[PDB]
């Protein structure tokens, strides 16, 4: 278990506690996308920065707060701009992949999304 592995664990794993509906199968995602954080280069505070943001973001979502969650994502995404680049000099194998995995990430992102805004809408928060 690396330090960045660890890093990307502990924010993907307070999102699946914290709305369960998401489950272990976001932790297993955001862990695939960790290694190709950790292929490009990425140091484990970028992750911890990054992770921190989306935990941030997907509350900003479940709570109506739109402020907070225009700040949240442009953080994440920030650091994920620093990851493409990177990923532009990987090996093809790894850069192919990466956009045969991101789909996946796409399906989760999309219903996490989804299914947090319609927390808000039902339950109120
Ligand atoms: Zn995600
Ligand atoms: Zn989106």
Not at 84 to 107: D, G, M, S
Request: negative net charge.
């Amino acid at each position: 278990l690396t330090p960045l592995q660890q890093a990307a664990l502990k924010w993907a794993r307070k999102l699946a506690e914290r709305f369960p509906e998401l489950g272990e199968e976001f932790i297993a995602v955001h862990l695939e996308e960790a290694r190709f954080w950790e292929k490009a280069g990425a140091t484990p505070e970028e992750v911890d920065a990054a992770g921190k943001a989306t935990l941030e973001y997907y509350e900003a979502i479940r709570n109506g707060d739109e402020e907070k969650a225009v700040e949240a994502r442009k953080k994440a995404l920030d650091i994920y701009n620093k990851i493409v680049e990177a990923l532009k000099k990987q090996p093809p194998e790894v850069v192919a992949a990466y956009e045969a995995f991101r789909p996946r990430h796409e399906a989760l992102h999309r219903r996490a999304e989804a299914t947090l805004r319609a927390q808000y809408e039902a339950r109120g928060s």
